[PDB]
Design a protein around this ligand. Structure first.
Ligand SMILES: N[C@@H]1[C@@H](O)[C@H](O)[C@@H](COP(=O)(O)O)O[C@@H]1O
Ligand SMILES: [Mg+2]
Ligand SMILES: [Mg+2]
Length: 90
RNA sequence: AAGCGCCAGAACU
RNA sequence: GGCACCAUUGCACUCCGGUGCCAGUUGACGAGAUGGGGUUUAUCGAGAUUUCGGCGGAUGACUCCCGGUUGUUCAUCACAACCGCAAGCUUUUACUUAAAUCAUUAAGGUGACUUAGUGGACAAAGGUGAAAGUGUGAUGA
């Protein structure tokens, strides 16, 4: 079902880790306070992000509102995290 | 203040 | 680390697909050492290392000079070795001669790395005094 962490994909792979990590924070900061955004660039983890909210309330609203939103010329695909994240789980 | 200087090899980011 | 091109729609949380091409970073730790000219592969140890490879320089070495020291107390030549404030050869002997490494803890940088402090060290080539044996002939005052 729902989760503190939201899984975003279909992100522009041409954008560098830190720029993407900050450009994400710009738009998701209104829904609630973000604990950490996790972005890698490997073959397995590129075009994806892990915006973690302290509140699931924020995660639900962010999912509803930002679904399909144009981000670097590419529409976002937002799900919930399949499993909890460590800064929540621990 | 001369085992001292710079850097298309090469290792490393 | 970054651009590009191929490949990838991918649920991760100690970094990490392939191909090129550009940027960056590392690249000698101190001791030692300059009369002039030419020549050549330029002294010494420390360090587990790239202190590798290339280029340049260089106070080294050889060798011909310029001066000087010393050669049976003085000079001027021969001849021999020597010195460029320091000066004939050999030997035994005594004293003198660092900084990195390290280990630390601070700054900076995505980054490999950088610059700086603290801790105690640990050399060799040299250098110094001491002895011991010793080093031409010709001519002149
Ligand atoms: N003092 C050193 C010398 O001992 C060394 O011969 C020379 C050449 O160095 P390299 O052999 O790295 O070219 O450099 C310096 O001058
Ligand atoms: Mg490869
Ligand atoms: Mg070299």
């Amino acid at each position: 079902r729902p989760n503190h962490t939201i899984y975003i994909n279909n992100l522009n792979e041409k954008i560098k880790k830190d720029e993407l990590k900050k450009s994400l924070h710009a738009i998701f900061s209104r829904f609630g306070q973000i604990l950490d955004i996790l972005v890698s660039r490997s073959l397995k983890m590129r075009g994806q992000a892990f915006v973690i909210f302290k509140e699931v309330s924020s995660a639900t609203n962010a999912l509803r509102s930002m679904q399909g939103f144009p981000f670097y010329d590419k529409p976002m695909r937002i799900q919930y995290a399949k499993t909890d994240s460590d800064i929540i789980a621990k």
